[PDB]
């Protein structure tokens, strides 16, 4: 007989406290871009990104992260 | 026979405080971009992206984020 | 007595010869101008020009300047 | 007596000859421009440009510039 | 007596050939400019200048310039 008493207790307090978030500024890509291109042979599949791309400011007031498992496997 | 006591007791505050969350600025692609070309060849698939593309600005006032498995699984 | 025999004699052909003047460009001010201006006190006259100004593209098929003066003063 | 026989003959072909005049380009200006400014105090005249400002191509398929005195003072 | 034979003769072909003239390329200020400026205090005039400005290209398919003076002067 397999008695499983599984008992996580979890009192966890993952906090911040940020009296003025502020002032935050980002600016990719300033510069200019050029892009000759000439006499050019592909015989496959091709990508291109040319510019500003993906570009991310992500400022989480909080951003408290809290990533669990319980995973109780049996055979 | 087999008894899962299976209790995953949780009181977790995952919290923030913010006073302001301000004055946050974001200006991806200011130049200029140009892009000249000429005699190409292609005999299979193109993809093209020019310009300013995907660009985000998340700012979650909160942004808490709280991921939670059980996976109880018997065999 | 004063004779002034004053002759200047000008056959000078100043001249310029083209077969195709072409694909001229010209672009000021591709990026991205931004101007915060905050708390300021002035006591006398102001100018300001802000942006794209005074650009200029002369492009004379010709352009051929002939200049000139024929002073004859006398006291 | 004063015999001023003043011949300036002028015979002088100042001249060009371009087959193709072609393919300019002129970007003043690519990048980015910012600008802050705060708790300034003036007392005095002020003047500001911010930008592309007086930016020239002269392209003249021609151009050829011919300048010419005759002073012929007496006293 | 002042018998002045001025004779100036003259004829001379100053002069220029191109075949093509071409593919010319002028990119000032392609970064970007940034400023900041704060608790200043003047009591005199200013000036500012802040960007690209007063870029020229000058591509005269001529350009032969022929300066001249005949400046006869008599006391």
Request: net charge positive; hydrophobic share 25%; aromatic share 4%.
């Given at each position: 007989s397999v008695q499983i008493v599984y008992k996580p207790v979890d009192l966890s307090k993952v906090t911040s406290k940020c009296g003025s978030l502020g002032n935050i500024h980002h600016k990719p890509g300033g510069g200019q871009v050029e892009v000759k291109s000439e006499k050019l042979d592909f015989k496959d599949r091709v990508q291109s990104k040319i510019g500003?791309?993906?570009?991310?400011?992500?400022?989480?007031?909080g951003g408290n992260k809290k990533i669990e498992t319980h995973k109780l496997t049996f055979r």
């Amino acid at each position: 007989s397999v008695q499983i008493v599984y008992k996580p207790v979890d009192l966890s307090k993952v906090t911040s406290k940020c009296g003025s978030l502020g002032n935050i500024h980002h600016k990719p890509g300033g510069g200019q871009v050029e892009v000759k291109s000439e006499k050019l042979d592909f015989k496959d599949r091709v990508q291109s990104k040319i510019g500003s791309l993906d570009n991310i400011t992500h400022v989480p007031g909080g951003g408290n992260k809290k990533i669990e498992t319980h995973k109780l496997t049996f055979r």
